[PDB]
Coordinates of C-alpha atoms and ligand atoms in Angstrom, one line a residue:
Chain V
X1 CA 38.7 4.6 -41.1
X2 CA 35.3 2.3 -40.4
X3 CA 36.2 2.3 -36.6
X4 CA 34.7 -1.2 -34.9
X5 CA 32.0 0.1 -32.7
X6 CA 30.6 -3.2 -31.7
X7 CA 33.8 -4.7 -30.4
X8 CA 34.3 -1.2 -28.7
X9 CA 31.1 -2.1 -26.7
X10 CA 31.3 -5.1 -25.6
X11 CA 34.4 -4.4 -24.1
X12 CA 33.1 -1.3 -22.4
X13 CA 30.1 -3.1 -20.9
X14 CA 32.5 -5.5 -19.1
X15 CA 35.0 -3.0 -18.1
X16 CA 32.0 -1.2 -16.6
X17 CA 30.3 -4.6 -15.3
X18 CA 33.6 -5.0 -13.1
X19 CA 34.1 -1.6 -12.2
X20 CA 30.7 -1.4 -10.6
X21 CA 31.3 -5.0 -9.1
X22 CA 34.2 -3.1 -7.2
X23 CA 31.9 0.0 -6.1
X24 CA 29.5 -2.8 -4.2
X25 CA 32.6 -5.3 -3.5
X26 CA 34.9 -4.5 0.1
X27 CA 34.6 -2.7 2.8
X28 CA 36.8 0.8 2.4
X29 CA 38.3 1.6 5.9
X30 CA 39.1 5.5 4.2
X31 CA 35.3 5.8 3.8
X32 CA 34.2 4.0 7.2
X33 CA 36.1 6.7 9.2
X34 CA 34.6 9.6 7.2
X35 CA 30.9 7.8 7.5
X36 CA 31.5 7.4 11.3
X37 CA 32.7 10.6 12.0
X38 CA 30.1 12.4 9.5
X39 CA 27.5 10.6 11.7
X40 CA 28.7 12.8 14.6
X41 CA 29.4 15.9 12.8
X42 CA 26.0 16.3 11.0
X43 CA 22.5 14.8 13.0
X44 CA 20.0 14.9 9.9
X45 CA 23.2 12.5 8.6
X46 CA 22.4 10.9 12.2
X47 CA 18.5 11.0 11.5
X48 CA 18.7 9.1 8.0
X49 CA 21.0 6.4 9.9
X50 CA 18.7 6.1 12.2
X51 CA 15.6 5.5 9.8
X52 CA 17.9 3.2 7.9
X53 CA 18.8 1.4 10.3
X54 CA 15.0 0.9 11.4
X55 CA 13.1 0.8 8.4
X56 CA 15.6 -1.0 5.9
X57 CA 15.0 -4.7 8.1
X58 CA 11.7 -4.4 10.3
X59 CA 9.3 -5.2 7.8
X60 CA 10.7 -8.2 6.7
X61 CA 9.6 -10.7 9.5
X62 CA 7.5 -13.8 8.4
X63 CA 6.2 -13.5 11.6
X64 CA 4.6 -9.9 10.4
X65 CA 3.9 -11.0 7.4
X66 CA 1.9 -14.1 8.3
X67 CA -0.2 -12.3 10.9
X68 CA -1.2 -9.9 8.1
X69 CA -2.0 -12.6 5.6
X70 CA -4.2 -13.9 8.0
X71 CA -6.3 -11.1 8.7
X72 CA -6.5 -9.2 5.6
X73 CA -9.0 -10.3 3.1
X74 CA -7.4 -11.9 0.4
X75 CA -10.4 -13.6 -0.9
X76 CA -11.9 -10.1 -1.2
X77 CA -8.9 -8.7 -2.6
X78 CA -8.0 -11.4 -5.4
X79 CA -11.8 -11.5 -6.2
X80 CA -11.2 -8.1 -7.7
X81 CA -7.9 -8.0 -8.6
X82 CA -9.1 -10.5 -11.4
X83 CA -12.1 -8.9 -11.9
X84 CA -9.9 -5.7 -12.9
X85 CA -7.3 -7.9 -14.4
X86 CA -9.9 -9.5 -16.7
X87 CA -11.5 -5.9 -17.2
X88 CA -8.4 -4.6 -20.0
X89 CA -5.3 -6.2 -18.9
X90 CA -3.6 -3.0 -20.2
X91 CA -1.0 -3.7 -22.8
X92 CA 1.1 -6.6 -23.5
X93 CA 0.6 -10.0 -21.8
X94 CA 2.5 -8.9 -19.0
X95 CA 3.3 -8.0 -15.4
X96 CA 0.7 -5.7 -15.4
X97 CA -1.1 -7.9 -12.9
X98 CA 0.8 -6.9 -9.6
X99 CA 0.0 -3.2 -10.2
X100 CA -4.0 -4.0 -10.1
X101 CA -2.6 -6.4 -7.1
X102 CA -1.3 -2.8 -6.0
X103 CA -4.1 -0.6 -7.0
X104 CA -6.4 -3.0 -5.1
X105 CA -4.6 -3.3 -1.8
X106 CA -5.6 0.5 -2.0
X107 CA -8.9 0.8 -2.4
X108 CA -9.3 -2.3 0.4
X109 CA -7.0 0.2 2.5
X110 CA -9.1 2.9 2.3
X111 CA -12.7 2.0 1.4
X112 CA -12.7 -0.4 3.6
X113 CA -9.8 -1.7 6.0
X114 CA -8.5 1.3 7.8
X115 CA -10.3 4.1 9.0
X116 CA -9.1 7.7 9.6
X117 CA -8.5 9.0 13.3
X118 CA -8.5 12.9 13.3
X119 CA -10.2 13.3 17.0
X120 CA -11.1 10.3 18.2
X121 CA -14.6 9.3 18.1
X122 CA -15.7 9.3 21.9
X123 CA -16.0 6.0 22.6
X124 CA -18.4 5.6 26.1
X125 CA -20.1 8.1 23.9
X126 CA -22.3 7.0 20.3
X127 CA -20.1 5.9 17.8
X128 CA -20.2 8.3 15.1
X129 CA -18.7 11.3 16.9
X130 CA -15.8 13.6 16.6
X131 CA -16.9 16.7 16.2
X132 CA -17.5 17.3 20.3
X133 CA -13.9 16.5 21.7
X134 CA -11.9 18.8 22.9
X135 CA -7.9 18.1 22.7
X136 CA -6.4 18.4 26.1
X137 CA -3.1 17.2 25.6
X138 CA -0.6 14.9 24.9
X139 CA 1.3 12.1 27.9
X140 CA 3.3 9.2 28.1
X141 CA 2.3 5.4 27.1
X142 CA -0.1 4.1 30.3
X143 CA 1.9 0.9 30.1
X144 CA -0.4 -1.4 28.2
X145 CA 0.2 0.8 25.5
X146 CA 4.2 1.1 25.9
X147 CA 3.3 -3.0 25.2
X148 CA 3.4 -1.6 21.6
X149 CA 5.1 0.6 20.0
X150 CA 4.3 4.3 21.6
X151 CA 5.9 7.0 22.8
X152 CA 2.8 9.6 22.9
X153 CA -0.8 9.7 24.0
X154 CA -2.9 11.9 22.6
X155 CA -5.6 12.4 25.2
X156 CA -9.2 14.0 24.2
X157 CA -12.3 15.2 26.8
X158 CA -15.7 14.4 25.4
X159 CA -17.5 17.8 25.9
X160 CA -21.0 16.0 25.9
X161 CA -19.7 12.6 28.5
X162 CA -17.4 14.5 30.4
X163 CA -14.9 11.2 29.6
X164 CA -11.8 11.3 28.3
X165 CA -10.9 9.1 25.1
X166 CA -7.2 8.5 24.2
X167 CA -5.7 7.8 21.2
X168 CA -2.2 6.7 21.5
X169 CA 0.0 6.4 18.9
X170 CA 1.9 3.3 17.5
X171 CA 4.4 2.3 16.0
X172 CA 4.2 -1.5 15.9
X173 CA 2.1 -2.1 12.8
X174 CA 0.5 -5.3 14.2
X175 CA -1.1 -3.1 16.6
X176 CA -2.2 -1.7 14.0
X177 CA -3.9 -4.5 13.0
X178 CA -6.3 -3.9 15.9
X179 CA -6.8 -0.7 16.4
X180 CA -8.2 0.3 12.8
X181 CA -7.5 4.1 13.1
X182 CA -4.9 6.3 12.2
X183 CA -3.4 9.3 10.9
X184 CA -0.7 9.3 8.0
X185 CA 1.7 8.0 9.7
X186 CA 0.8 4.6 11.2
X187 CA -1.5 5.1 8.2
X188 CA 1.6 4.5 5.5
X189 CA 3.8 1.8 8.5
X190 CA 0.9 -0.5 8.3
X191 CA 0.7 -0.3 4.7
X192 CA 3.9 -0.6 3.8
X193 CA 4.2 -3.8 5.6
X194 CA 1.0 -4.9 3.8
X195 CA 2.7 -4.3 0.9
X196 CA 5.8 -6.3 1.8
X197 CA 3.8 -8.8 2.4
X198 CA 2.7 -9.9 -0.7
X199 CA 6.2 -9.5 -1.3
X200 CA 6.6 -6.3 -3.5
X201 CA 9.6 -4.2 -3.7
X202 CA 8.8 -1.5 -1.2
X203 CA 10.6 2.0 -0.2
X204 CA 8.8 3.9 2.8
X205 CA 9.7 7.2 2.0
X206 CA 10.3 10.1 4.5
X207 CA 9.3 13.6 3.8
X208 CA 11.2 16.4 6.1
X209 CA 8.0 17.8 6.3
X210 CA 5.9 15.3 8.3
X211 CA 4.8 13.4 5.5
X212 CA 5.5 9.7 4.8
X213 CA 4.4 7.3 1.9
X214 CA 5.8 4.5 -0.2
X215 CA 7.2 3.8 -3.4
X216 CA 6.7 0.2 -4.8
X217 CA 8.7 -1.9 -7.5
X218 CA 6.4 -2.2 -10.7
X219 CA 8.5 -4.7 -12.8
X220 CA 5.8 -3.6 -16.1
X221 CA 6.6 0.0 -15.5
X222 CA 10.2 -1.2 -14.0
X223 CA 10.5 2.0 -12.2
X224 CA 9.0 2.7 -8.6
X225 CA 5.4 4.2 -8.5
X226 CA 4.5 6.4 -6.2
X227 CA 2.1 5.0 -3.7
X228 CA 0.1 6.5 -0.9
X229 CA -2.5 4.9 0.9
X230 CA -4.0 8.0 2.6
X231 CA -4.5 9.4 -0.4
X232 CA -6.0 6.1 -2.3
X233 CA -3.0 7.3 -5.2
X234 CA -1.5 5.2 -7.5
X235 CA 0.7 7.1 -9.3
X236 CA 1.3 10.2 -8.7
X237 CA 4.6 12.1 -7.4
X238 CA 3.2 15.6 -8.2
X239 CA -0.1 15.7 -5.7
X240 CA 2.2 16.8 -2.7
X241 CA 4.1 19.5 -4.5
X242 CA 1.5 21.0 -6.5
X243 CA -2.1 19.9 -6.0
X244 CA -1.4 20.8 -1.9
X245 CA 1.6 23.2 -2.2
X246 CA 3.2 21.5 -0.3
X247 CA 6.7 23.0 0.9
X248 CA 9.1 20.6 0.6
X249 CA 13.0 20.2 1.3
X250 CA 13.8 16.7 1.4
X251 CA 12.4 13.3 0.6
X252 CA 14.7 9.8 1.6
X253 CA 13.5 6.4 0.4
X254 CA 14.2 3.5 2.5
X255 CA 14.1 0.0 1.3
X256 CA 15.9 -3.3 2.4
X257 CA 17.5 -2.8 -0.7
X258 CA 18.6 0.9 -0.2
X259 CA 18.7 4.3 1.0
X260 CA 18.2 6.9 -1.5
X261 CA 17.2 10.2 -1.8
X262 CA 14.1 10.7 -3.9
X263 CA 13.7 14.2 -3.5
X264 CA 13.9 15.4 -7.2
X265 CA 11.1 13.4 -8.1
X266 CA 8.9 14.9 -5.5
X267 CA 10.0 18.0 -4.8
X268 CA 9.8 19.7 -8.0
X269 CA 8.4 23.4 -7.3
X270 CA 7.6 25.0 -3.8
X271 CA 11.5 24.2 -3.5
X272 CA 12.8 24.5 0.2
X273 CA 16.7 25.6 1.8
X274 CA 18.4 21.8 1.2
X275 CA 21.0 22.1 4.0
X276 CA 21.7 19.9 7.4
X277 CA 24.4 18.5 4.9
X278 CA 26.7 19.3 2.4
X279 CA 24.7 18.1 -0.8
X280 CA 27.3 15.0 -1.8
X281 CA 28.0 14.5 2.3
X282 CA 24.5 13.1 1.4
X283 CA 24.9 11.6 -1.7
X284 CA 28.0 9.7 0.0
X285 CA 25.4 9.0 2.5
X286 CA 23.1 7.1 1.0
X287 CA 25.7 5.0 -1.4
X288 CA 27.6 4.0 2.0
X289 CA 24.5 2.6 3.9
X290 CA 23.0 0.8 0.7
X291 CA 26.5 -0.7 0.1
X292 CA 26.9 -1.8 4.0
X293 CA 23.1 -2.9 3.6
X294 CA 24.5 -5.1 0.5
X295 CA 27.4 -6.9 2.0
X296 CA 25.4 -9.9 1.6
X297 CA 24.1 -10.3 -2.1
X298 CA 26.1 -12.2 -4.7
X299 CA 27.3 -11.0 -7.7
X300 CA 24.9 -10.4 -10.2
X301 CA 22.1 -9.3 -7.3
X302 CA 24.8 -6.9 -6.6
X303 CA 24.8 -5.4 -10.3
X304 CA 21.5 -6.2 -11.1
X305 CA 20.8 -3.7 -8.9
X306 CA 23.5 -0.8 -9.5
X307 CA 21.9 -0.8 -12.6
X308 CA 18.5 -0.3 -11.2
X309 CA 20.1 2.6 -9.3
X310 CA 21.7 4.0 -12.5
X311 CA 18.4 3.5 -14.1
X312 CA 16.7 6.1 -11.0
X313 CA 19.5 8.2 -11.1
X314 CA 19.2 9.2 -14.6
X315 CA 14.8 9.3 -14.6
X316 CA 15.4 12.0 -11.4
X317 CA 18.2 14.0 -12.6
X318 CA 16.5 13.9 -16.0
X319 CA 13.1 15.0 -14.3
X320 CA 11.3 13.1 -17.2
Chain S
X1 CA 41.5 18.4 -22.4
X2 CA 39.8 15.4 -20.0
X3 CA 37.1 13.7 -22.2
X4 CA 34.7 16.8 -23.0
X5 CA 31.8 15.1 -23.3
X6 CA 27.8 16.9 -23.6
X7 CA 26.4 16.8 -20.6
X8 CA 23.3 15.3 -22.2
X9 CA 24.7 12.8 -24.0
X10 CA 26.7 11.7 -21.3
X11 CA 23.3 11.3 -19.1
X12 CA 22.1 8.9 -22.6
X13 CA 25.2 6.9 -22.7
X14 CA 24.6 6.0 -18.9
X15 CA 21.7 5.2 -19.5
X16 CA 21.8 2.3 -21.8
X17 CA 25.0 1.1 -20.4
X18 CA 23.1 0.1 -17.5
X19 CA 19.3 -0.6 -19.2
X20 CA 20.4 -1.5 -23.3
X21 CA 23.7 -2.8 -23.1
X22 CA 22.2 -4.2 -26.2
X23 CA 22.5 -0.5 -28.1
X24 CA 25.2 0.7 -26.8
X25 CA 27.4 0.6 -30.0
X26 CA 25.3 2.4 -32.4
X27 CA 24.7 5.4 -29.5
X28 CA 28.8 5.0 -29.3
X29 CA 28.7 5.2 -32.9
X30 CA 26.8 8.5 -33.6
X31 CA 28.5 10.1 -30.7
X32 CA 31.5 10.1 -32.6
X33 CA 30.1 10.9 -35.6
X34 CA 29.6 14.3 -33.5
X35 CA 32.8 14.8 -31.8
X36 CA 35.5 15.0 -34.2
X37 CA 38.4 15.3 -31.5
X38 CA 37.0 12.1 -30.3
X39 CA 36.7 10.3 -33.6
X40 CA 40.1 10.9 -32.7
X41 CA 40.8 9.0 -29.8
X42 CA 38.8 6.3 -30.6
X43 CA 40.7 5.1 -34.1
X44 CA 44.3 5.8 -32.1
X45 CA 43.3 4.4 -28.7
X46 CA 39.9 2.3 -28.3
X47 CA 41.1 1.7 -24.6
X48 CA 41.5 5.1 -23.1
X49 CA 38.1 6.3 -24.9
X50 CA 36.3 3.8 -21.9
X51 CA 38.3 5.0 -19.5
X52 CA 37.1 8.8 -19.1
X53 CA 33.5 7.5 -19.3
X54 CA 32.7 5.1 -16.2
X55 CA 34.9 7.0 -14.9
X56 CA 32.1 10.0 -15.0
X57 CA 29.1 8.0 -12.9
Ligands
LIG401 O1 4.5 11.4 11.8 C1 5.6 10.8 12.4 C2 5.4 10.7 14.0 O2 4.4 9.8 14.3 C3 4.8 8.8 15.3 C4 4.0 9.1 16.5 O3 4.8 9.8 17.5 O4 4.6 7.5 14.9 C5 4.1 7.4 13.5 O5 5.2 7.6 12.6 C6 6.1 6.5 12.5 C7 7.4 7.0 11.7 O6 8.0 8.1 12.3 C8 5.3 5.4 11.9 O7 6.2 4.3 11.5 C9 4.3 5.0 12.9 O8 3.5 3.9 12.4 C10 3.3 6.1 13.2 O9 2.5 5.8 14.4 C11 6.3 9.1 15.5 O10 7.1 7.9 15.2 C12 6.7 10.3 14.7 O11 7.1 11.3 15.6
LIG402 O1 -3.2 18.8 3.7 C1 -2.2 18.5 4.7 C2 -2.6 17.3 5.6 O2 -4.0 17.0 5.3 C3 -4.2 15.6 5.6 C4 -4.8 15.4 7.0 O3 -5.3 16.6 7.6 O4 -5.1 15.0 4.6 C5 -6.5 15.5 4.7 O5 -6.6 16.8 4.1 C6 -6.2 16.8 2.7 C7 -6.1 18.2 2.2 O6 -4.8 18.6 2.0 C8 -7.1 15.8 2.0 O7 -6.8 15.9 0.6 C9 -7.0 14.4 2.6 O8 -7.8 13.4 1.9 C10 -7.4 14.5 4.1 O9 -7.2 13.2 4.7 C11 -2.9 14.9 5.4 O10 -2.9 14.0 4.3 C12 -1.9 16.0 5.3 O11 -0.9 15.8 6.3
LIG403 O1 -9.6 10.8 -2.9 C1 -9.1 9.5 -3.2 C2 -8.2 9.5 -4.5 O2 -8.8 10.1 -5.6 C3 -7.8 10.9 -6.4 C4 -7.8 10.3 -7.8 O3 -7.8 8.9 -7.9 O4 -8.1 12.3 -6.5 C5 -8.6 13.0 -5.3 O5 -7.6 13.5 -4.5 C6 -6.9 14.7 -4.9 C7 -5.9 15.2 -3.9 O6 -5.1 14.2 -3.4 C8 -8.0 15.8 -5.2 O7 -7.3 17.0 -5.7 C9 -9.1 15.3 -6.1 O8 -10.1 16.3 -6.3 C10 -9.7 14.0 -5.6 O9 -10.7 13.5 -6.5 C11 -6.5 10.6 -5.7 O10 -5.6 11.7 -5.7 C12 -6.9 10.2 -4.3 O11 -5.9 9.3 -3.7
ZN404 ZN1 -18.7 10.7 25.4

């Protein structure tokens, strides 16, 4: 024999073409009863529905992204981008650019946008002062501040004022916008958002552990990166796991694009008990809300992008 | 029996089907040139060797 291998291909490649074209195409109503009931059987099945649900749209409102246009410095920002750009330009004439783009926006973040809240600083008191507050508890929103996004108070007694300072915690990023402080969390919402706003591909990604960050799109790398902006870290998935130990168990991305768990590219040592769902109830998860979340695209979109998934699949499971 | 295909290889294939469709025949190629009983099935039925393999994704 001399078997045609080339023939053999091509007509693979379109069999495959259709057959994920079918994956992404209808609405199963076999699968929508299992999804609907899993939802009520398992709650961390609930819980990763309910960030979907939230996350997966929110950022994307021109409103939003405006208002953050405005007010950032983009003169400031592009000013070095191209200064950086200029500097190398790493390798081919390329897309390279949106990672400095990237890499910038974190820097500004950090060295110079937001600023970190462990204590509050005392504010009838001087400025510069955390050290002398003394935590005494946690409350409701007062009511201007259930005008954003806040369930919780955090409420701190100046030890040398006598005056209590509160720092309430919000959710609605443009708040965000005023208030310059923050912990992780509003730390990576704002951010994420800033980041959709130049129009990347962004995941915010949810650790079990009370930990959240964001993987972006690089389109020269074509794979997602790792960003944090508490951390001012480009690229680097390991940090959690091994430079801080961290224990970890689970780690979901969610993107407008999809739901998908990203936990072998994260969690790879310091391994924790992966169980408030049978591991493919999961997997089944994920694929469901991404494909409901996709009812819209047309038909190369649609591939385009199982292949980008495909692409993931095998960089994780192969641990690279 | 079913296909009986190396994990590994498997993964590779996978891989290019969905990020070098453009290589995809000479990776077919070599993976038969490494699986007799599939050398096989490919020279009786071309067909039924891509069914087993989308199939497994
Ligand atoms: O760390 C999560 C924890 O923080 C809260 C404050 O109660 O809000 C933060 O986390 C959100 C995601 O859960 C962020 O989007 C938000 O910006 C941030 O303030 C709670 O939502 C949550 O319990
Ligand atoms: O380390 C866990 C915890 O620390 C935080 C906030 O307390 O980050 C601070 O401490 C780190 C040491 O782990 C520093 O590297 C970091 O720069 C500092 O802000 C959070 O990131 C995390 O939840
Ligand atoms: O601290 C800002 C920024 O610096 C980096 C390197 O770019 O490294 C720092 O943070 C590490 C922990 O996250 C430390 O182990 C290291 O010593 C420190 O220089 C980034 O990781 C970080 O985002
Ligand atoms: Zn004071």
């Amino acid at each position: 024999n001399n078997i045609d291998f080339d023939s053999i291909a091509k007509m693979l490649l379109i069999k495959y073409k259709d057959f994920i074209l079918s994956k992404f195409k209808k609405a199963a109503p076999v699968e929508n009863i299992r999804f609907q009931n899993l939802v009520h059987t398992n709650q961390f099945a609930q819980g990763v529905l309910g960030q979907s649900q939230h996350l997966c749209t929110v950022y994307d409102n021109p409103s939003w992204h405006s208002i953050v246009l405005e007010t950032l410095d983009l003169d400031l920002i592009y000013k070095n981008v191209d200064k950086e750009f200029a500097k190398d330009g790493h390798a081919e004439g390329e897309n390279i650019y949106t990672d400095y783009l990237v890499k910038e926006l974190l820097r500004y973040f950090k060295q110079d946008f937001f600023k970190w809240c462990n204590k509050p600083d005392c504010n009838h008191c001087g400025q510069n002062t955390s050290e002398n507050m003394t935590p005494l508890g946690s409350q409701g929103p007062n009511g201007e501040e259930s005008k954003f996004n806040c369930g919780t108070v955090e409420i701190y007694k100046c030890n040398r004022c006598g005056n209590i300072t509160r720092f309430p915690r919000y959710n609605d990023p443009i708040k965000l916008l005023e208030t310059r402080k923050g912990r992780c969390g509003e730390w990576c919402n704002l951010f994420t958002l800033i980041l959709k706003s130049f129009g990347l591909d962004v995941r915010y990604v949810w650790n079990r552990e009370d930990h959240v960050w964001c993987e972006y799109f690089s389109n020269f790398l074509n794979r997602w990166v790792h960003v944090d902006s508490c951390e001012q870290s480009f690229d680097q998935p390991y940090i959690y796991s091994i430079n801080w130990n961290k224990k970890m168990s689970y780690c979901i991305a969610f993107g407008k694009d999809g739901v998908v768990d990203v936990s072998k590219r994260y969690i790879l040592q310091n391994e924790l008990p992966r169980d408030q769902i049978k591991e493919e109830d999961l997997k089944f998860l994920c694929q469901f809300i991404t494909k409901r979340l996709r009812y819209s695209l047309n038909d190369d979109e649609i591939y385009q992008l199982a292949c980008r998934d495909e692409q993931e699949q095998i960089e994780l499971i192969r641990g690279k | 029996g079913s296909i009986g295909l190396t994990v590994e290889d498997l993964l590779s294939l996978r891989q290019v089907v969905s990020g070098n469709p453009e290589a995809l025949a000479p990776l077919l190629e070599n993976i038969s040139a490494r699986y007799p009983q599939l050398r096989e099935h490919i020279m009786a039925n071309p067909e039924v060797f891509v069914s087993m393999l989308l199939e497994a994704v």
